[PDB]
């Protein structure tokens, strides 16, 4: 959320009585929640050094944001003129979206100030010049009390120039850790999202993530380099739409998770659960030997608990298949559910050290994988070979074995 | 009924958390919804002590206004503004699917909203981006009329009460006034003021009279027919006014400010003049700012008499929602009077709570997981019951806050006020076996209608338990009895130490 | 650095009077039905009136959504209709061949103080424009017979592909990408978003329309097949393979 | 973001003298640039010894700034606006200008001369001072400032401005540091011809800095504290002589719900299992303690020798917790540990009280993280956040499995090395940590391994979480009891199976659903189920209700095989 304005001021750099406060909206507010303009004055108002900067610090319980600017001509009395739009929060909060409206309306009254003396001429005293050669009030209320009200204002000045302040919030950059193995989901339909301003490659990418194309198989479907997918990806996961899974194979060690309570606990996950894994019709799958209506909640949790960390998909599809056939489950999908759920993980495989005669580039590529100690995914992706093949080229190269974590 | 209603004419306070920057009141005077960051929440007026249900929809930016559709056909649509949109909610969908549709209008964010009161689904919205959209709910797709200032952002928008297709809107320190036949091109341009326009509002049985508040403490009124500048009527007050509107009944004006004076209402009888401020009756209390009023209505269903009486509902910053009696002197001080005849037969509205939750290949039927351990044990219902005030110990709501309270320990099951049912569980040494143990207990109570009042005591019933024999049951069930018969003689509240025996603290005489 | 530069601001604006979404623009092609409108905010005036310059524009772009969103309309009123067109669609070979008005006679009236002809394009995009192929080819054989040098400069940050980029389709309806030779591109001013998403930036989808449609396909047989090893092998087999 | 970080830029000591205010000793010299991004007889004795530990890319030509001059401000005015008046002093003073976060706790004196309330230059200057402040410069994220800053006031700047203070209100040390600060730099810059005969600004800086952290002892403090928080270290610092102060910011290694390493990283290595030590530090602010075993994180000798830097002479504290790192292992519960207190001093006993203290001192400051009491009767897997990958433990050139590898066969060279050991334990189904052992000669070191595999958050536990279930035909058994006080077929495969969630938050019927489940088993069964009833929620492992409840491992085995179809087994760390 934002937090709301607390008291907004306008300091002002008079040549003969100082630096004072010239309009507060609210009236007297600062002297009544006690805040002083005696103790952190020299900061409101700086010497020339610490001027057009974001200058924010704490005073008691609350939080002082301000942007002071300073103006260098001989037009001006004792050649300067200083001024600062001044923004209080109370401390307990995020003063992180508000900082560069503030730094953009000082920088937009500091060259309405060179431009036109829009603020200096407003005082209507000829002491702030050198005598030799609109409302500040209803704006800081309009100021305020939209800031509080909408988050953005359309607040007019003059005949040409408006205060156009939209706060928008802060988010976390994405991951850097995202490479070739790794299928995007999409937890938004990015088909309706698209509008004429996207990137060209983010055009390409959206009908080819279904939650089970690699990020090189999107690359090669779409025609693109893998790094502009890498970031394309990033910035879908920036404004958290899109998360990362793991490619769906059946020599997978899936096992579950600490969050297979979940599973009871949660009143939604069930229900659809029983509706996803099944197959629209009585699919020719469901009637195929192992060698030659909608399901139980029960047989679904008994199914998720049934992987164990060491059991591959084959084993525990060929351990238990009548089941997975009378209740008519898809069993990718059923996967799916408990990745994207996160009720169950992958024991990903580690091929550390202790055919047809392949390329000078395809061997260079497995040694720079094998002494990197990278998966079984990264090898069979870069290789665009399977794991079978891959274990086979690893085996004629050296003695090796597969770690499960 | 609206007339068994235990809430109108007695003062009570709220406490609704949260920040919540606007309000709006069922027309039927039951419901009362309030718009924050995170959703809507629907409170029962008249029964506060139900927690309010809460519709999830979560956007950075603030909400503006919040206004009930007065239509009385769909008294289930609720349009609340959403940053650029406008979101018309369904109260009798689920909780988490309440959204209907969306106007998808305006470029920057949604400023107020108004409905039409001659045609209840026609709707007008005012946006910072200088665009005021009229809306229909027949076809909420694209706006069918649209207007800008093409200088400041809107302040309000408010339809006129006579003439159906005249609407004004509010821009800065000019106020403008758009024709739905003309459109673009104001019919006049009201230019008095030198602060900019906080509030906008029409007389309701005058045709071309219009009231304005401002920042610089000037309340202006105009009679647009005779002469756009200048103003038929200026009152002056000592602080900026944020919401002046015209009172429902006889001729009057209630103004508030958003900073100084005493953050009260003051209301101002109406019986080219600069004058000063002379309220009747300032509405006291609320020690932050006040965020908005609203009027609730009760009259009876048939009868052809203006015999309704009015209760004012504030909701202000400090997280307050009042409720308001207006007095029979009000009655009397502003020119209003039981009309012998009526014109027109005043509309009659449901009278529904839209507050409890609706209920909603082949699935086979199973109990997959037990309902009791998946609950949630109700803590946000005891700080609910903490922040009601009606008019030591007062009603059966304040005693039930006070014990969940004074024993963090007591996980209750089932808190309903209304219906007197208290059902909570504790653990106490009450075996015969090992008397070092504690036995879980789900101990459910009922209350007769006076239970403080007369000598009737509570009736627990606690549900059997293997652990629990029949001689402890009956010497529990003779004890608690004993206690409530006694301790009511005072007429004073006996859940504490009925509570405080069963848990086996202390013993109490 | 004390110059005496003779500055010409001029707006140049196209509307679209197409009431069809954006969403539904195919790239690489132009606006069908569209209105050019070019407004002059100042002549030629000397840099040293550069306070009075920027207040013209300042008030003339401040006073643009009236003078183009308002019509006249012969019953007796002004409808606030019209939309102004993206960038993407945007006229931007009109301006190229706008600029190129003032110079196309070399025998022009003298300016007597001032030589060059130097023309910028302030533009809000990211150096991504749908074009015309004849425009695009008449525009590079008319800017290789003048002295002007055009400097694109954006107003947004510089995107992940190169920059200025040009989609066209042919006669056959195919899209193609070129990059021109007579445009230069300057971007005015951790990590960086540098693509933009406007309708979730702004989160303009609310949350109940926003929810997947499309799930993962469901598996499928090969007809080929006879058992579940059989399946579960074809499937591990083809798990990496590329179409 | 879990990963650890503390965005540390530099240290300021200013004091405020009646002539204005000053700045004494700051102690990276380096510019923005990089950091955004008798003459030496007692110097020479002291850096050799080791005294002087200070960082030398500081010092750097690349990486030199002068000493009047700190990041793009001069000397004077920084003294000036890290000096603020009383109304601001005493308190927090986190002020930004942009993208620097200068925060400290500044100290001021009362009204009187009073610091707080319960060479003639040096009495001058202390009898003068009115103000010190210790600045520390920080540059987070936009999106981790209110987490940083807080983190760092809260762990290291409040607790050592608050001993500053009291040291300066016993025996003037603060004041008496800046003087020789300030005379050491009028004695180098003026005098001790040494100085103008080293060319170079950087080498110049570096021997001023050299000389000065030789005579004074503040300097050295804060020098430290800069290079090891930076370094995520623990900071040692000796202050006056006679105190030490221990100053870190936590690392969060620890977890439970499996982060996604793929969007959020995550430290590899990291302990993810289900017991935790932070539930026992919240908790001091049930379950005990006792019952589980510390494992420690690093060999006991270098354990004793980073505990003899917590004090500086051997008080009973540090007597105690080296006694017990000499005699502690990760396989026997604590509980049974209470003789090396009884024997070293003359239930609720202190004893246990001291225990408690020193288990807590030695899981905070990363000494010995407790698990529970390892046997070989244990399921151990591999857990996901293996340090398996990456060059070091927070890459995101030798990945971790061929160091940890080397690490393994030179501690343990009688045995198959990690790649084997650690396939062993994860290709095939888990099991109990006995199968691997192929004798009765080859247990302990076995063990010792387990141990540094868990040390090192290789392997994790796999514990037991069983779940109650009830079926139709217990429904239709109570329904008949109920009456005691479709129909043509019978479908072999549906069975009305519900789950009881919470045995002990339950209804008649529901209760009486899990007592009819036992209808028929003899006492022993019927006596531990009842008694072990409520801990099957699925949230309690078994292991720990065991240890917790002094039963046999044979029973709950017995109890478990008994009731074979009603009894859910969840498996998970």
């Known amino acids: 959320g934002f937090v709301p304005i607390h008291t907004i001021f306008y300091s002002v750099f008079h040549p003969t009585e100082g630096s004072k406060i010239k309009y507060e909206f609210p009236p007297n507010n600062l002297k009544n929640h006690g805040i002083n303009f005696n103790t952190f004055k020299n900061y409101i108002i700086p010497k020339p050094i610490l001027c057009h900067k974001l200058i924010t610090f704490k005073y008691g319980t609350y939080r002082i944001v301000c942007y002071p600017v300073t103006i260098n001509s001989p037009i001006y009395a004792r050649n300067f003129f200083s001024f600062n739009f001044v923004f209080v929060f109370p401390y307990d909060c995020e003063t992180s979206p508000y900082e560069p409206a503030i730094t953009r309306l000082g920088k937009m009254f500091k060259v309405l100030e060179e431009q036109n003396q829009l603020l200096s001429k407003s005082e209507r005293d000829p002491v702030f010049f050198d005598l030799k050669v609109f409302s500040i009030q209803d704006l800081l209320m309009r100021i305020f009390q939209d800031l509080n009200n909408y988050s953005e204002c359309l607040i007019p000045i003059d005949e040409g120039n408006a205060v156009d302040i939209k706060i928008f919030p802060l988010l976390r950059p994405p991951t850097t850790c995202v490479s070739l193995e790794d299928v995007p989901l999409s937890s938004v339909n990015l088909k309706k999202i698209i509008d004429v301003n996207w990137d060209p490659t983010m055009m390409s990418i959206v009908p080819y993530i279904d939650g089970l194309n690699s990020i090189a198989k999107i690359s090669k479907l779409s025609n693109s380099d893998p790094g502009l997918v890498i970031e394309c990806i990033r910035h879908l996961i920036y404004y958290k739409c899109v998360t990362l899974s793991d490619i769906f194979q059946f020599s997978n060690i899936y096992a579950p998770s600490s969050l297979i309570r979940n599973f009871l606990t949660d009143p939604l996950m069930a229900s659809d659960c029983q509706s996803y894994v099944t197959f629209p019709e009585v699919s020719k799958i469901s009637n195929l030997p192992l060698n030659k209506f909608l399901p139980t909640r029960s047989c679904l949790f008994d199914l998720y608990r049934s992987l164990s960390q060491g059991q591959t998909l084959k084993t525990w599809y060929e351990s238990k298949y009548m089941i997975l056939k009378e209740n008519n489950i898809d069993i990718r999908r059923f996967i799916t559910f408990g990745l994207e759920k996160r009720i169950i993980y992958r024991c990903y495989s580690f091929p550390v050290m202790i055919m047809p005669k392949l390329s000078d580039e395809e061997e260079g590529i497995l040694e720079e994988s094998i002494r990197n100690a990278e998966t079984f995914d990264k090898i069979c992706v870069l290789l665009s070979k399977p794991k079978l093949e891959v274990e086979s080229y690893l085996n004629e190269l050296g003695e090796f074995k597969v770690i499960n974590s | 009924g609206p007339y068994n209603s235990p809430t109108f004419g007695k003062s009570l306070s709220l406490k609704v958390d949260g920040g919540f920057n606007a309000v709006s009141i069922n027309p039927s005077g039951r419901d009362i919804v309030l718009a924050s960051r995170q959703g809507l929440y629907i409170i029962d007026l008249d029964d506060p002590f139900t927690p309010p249900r809460w519709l999830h929809h979560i956007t950075p930016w603030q909400v503006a206004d919040v206004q009930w559709s007065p239509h009385p056909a769909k008294p289930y649509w609720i349009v609340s503004t959403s940053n650029q949109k406008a979101i018309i909610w369904n109260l009798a969908k689920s909780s988490s699917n309440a959204i209907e549709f969306v106007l998808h209008g305006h470029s920057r964010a949604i400023t107020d909203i108004n409905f039409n009161p001659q045609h209840p689904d026609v709707l007008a919205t005012c946006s910072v981006d200088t665009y005021v959209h009229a809306w229909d709910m027949r076809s909420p797709h694209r706006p069918f009329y649209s207007t800008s200032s093409w200088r400041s952002a809107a302040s309000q928008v408010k339809w006129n009460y006579k003439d159906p297709n005249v609407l004004a809107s509010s821009h800065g320190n000019d106020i403008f006034v758009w024709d739905l036949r003309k459109g673009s091109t104001p019919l006049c341009s009201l230019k008095g003021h030198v602060s900019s326009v906080n509030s906008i509002d029409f007389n309701r049985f005058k045709y071309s009279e219009i009231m304005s508040s401002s920042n610089d403490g000037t309340v202006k009124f105009w009679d647009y027919s005779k002469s756009t500048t200048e103003s038929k009527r200026t009152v002056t007050t000592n602080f900026p006014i944020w919401r002046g509107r015209y009172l429902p009944f006889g001729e009057g004006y209630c103004i508030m400010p958003m900073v100084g004076g005493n953050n009260a209402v003051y209301l101002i009888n109406l019986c080219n003049k600069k004058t000063k401020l002379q309220p009747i009756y300032a509405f006291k209390g609320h020690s932050d700012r006040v965020i908005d009023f609203l009027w609730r209505s009760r009259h009876t269903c048939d009868g052809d008499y203006d015999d309704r009486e009015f209760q004012l509902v504030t909701w202000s910053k400090d997280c307050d929602l009042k409720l308001w009696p207006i007095s029979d002197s009000i009655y009397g001080k502003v020119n209003f009077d039981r009309g012998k005849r009526l014109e027109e037969k005043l509309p009659d509205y449901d009278y529904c709570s839209y507050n409890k939750e609706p209920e909603n290949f082949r699935r086979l039927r199973e109990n997959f997981v037990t309902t009791s351990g998946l609950k949630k044990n109700k803590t946000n219902h005891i700080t609910w019951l903490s922040g009601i005030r009606m008019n030591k110990i007062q009603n059966l709501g304040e ?55 007369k000598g009737d005591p509570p009736k627990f019933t606690i549900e059997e338990n293997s652990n629990l024999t029949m001689s402890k049951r009956q010497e529990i069930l003779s004890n608690l009895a004993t206690i409530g018969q006694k301790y009511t003689d005072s007429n004073l509240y006996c859940l504490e130490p009925c509570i405080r025996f069963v848990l086996g603290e202390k013993v109490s005489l | 650095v004390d110059t005496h530069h003779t500055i010409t601001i001029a707006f140049a604006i196209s509307m679209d009077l197409s009431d069809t979404s954006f969403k539904d623009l195919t790239p690489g092609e132009s606006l069908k039905n569209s209105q050019d409108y070019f407004r002059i905010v100042v002549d030629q005036v000397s840099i040293i009136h550069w306070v009075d310059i920027m207040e013209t524009l300042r008030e003339e772009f401040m006073e643009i959504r009236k003078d183009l969103l308002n019509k006249q309309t012969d019953k007796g009123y002004s409808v606030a209709n019209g939309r102004f067109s993206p960038v993407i669609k945007s006229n931007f070979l009109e301006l190229v061949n706008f600029a190129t008005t003032i110079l196309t006679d070399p025998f022009k009236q003298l300016d007597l103080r001032h030589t060059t002809t130097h023309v910028m394009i ?91 449609e499309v799930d993962v396909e469901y598996l499928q047989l090969n007809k080929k097949v006879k058992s579940l090893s059989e399946f579960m092998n074809d499937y591990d087999k083809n798990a990496f393979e590329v179409k | 973001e879990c990963l650890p970080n503390s965005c540390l830029l530099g240290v300021h000591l200013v004091i405020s003298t009646h002539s204005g205010p000053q700045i004494v000793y700051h102690y990276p010299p380096s510019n923005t640039a990089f950091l955004t991004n008798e003459e030496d007889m007692e110097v020479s004795a002291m850096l050799q010894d080791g005294k002087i530990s200070m960082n030398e890319i500081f010092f750097e030509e690349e990486n030199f700034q002068d000493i009047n001059k700190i990041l793009e401000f001069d000397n004077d005015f920084v003294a000036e606006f890290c000096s603020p008046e009383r109304e601001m002093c005493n308190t927090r003073f986190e002020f930004t200008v942009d993208n620097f976060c200068f925060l400290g706790l500044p100290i001021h004196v009362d009204s009187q001369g009073r610091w707080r309330k319960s060479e003639r230059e040096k009495e001058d200057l202390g009898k003068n001072m009115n103000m010190f402040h210790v600045c520390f410069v920080m540059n987070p994220h936009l999106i981790e400032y209110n987490k940083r800053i807080d983190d760092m006031y809260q762990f290291v700047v409040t607790r050592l401005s608050l001993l500053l203070r009291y040291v300066q209100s016993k025996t003037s040390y603060i004041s008496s540091e800046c003087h020789i600060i300030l005379k050491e730099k009028e004695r180098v810059l003026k005098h001790s011809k040494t100085y103008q005969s080293i060319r170079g600004a950087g080498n110049k800086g570096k021997y001023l800095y050299q000389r000065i952290l030789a005579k004074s002892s503040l300097a050295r403090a804060l020098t430290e504290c800069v290079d090891k928080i930076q370094r995520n270290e623990i900071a040692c610092l000796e202050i006056n002589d006679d105190k030490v102060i221990s100053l870190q910011i936590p690392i969060q290694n620890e977890f439970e719900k499996m982060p996604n390493f793929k969007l959020q990283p995550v430290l590899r290595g990291s302990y993810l299992t289900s017991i935790l030590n932070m539930k026992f530090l919240e908790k001091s602010s049930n379950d005990d303690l006792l019952n589980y075993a510390l494992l420690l994180l690093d060999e006991p000798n270098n354990i004793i020798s980073s505990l003899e830097t917590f004090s500086y002479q051997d008080d009973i504290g540090t007597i105690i917790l080296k006694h017990l790192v000499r005699n502690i292992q990760p396989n026997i519960p604590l509980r049974s540990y209470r003789y090396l207190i009884t024997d070293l001093l003359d239930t609720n006993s202190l004893e246990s009280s001291i225990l408690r203290s020193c288990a807590l001192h030695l899981m905070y400051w990363r000494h010995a993280r407790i698990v529970i009491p390892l046997s070989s009767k244990y399921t151990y897997i591999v857990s996901p956040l293996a340090p398996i990958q990456g060059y070091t433990i927070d890459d995101y050139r030798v990945p971790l499995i061929y160091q940890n590898s080397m690490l393994f ?10 790649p084997i050991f650690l396939s062993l334990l994860s290709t095939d189904k888990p099991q109990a940590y006995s199968n691997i052992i192929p004798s009765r000669e080859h247990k302990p070191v076995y063990l010792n391994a387990l141990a540094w595999l868990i040390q090192y958050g290789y392997v994790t536990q796999l514990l037991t979480f069983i779940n109650i279930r009830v079926d139709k035909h217990i429904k239709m058994a109570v329904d008949e009891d109920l009456e005691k006080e479709f129909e043509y077929d019978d479908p072999e495969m549906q069975h009305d199976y519900t789950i009881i969630l919470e045995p002990e938050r339950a209804t008649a019927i529901e209760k009486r659903w899990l007592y009819r489940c036992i209808y028929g088993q003899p006492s022993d069964i019927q006596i531990l189920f009842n008694k072990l009833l409520k801990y099957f929620n699925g949230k309690v492992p078994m292991e720990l209700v065991i240890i917790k409840e002094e039963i046999s491992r044979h029973d709950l085995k017995k109890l478990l095989n008994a009731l074979d179809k009603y009894l859910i087994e969840i498996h998970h760390w």
């Open chain 2, 399 to 453: 005693e039930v806050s006070a014990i969940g309270h004074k024993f963090p320990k007591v996980v209750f099951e089932k808190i309903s006020v209304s219906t007197r049912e208290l059902c909570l569980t504790l653990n106490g040494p009450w075996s015969e076996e090992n008397p070092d143990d504690y036995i879980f207990l789900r101990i459910s109570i009922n209350f007769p209608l006076n239970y403080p009042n």
């Open chain 3, 122 to 212: 302030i533009s809000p995009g990211s150096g991504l424009f749908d074009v015309d192929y004849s425009l695009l080819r008449l525009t590079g054989k008319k800017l290789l017979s003048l002295e002007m040098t055009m400097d694109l400069i954006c107003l947004s940050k510089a995107p992940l592909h190169i920059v200025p980029l040009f989609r066209y389709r042919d006669f056959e309806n195919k899209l193609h990408h070129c990059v021109p030779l007579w445009l230069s591109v300057f971007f005015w001013n951790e990590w960086t978003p540098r693509c933009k998403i406007y309708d979730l930036q702004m989160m303009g989808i609310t949350e109940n329309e926003l929810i997947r």
């Open chain 4, 409 to 418: 066969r030179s501690k343990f060279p009688s045995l198959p090395s990690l």
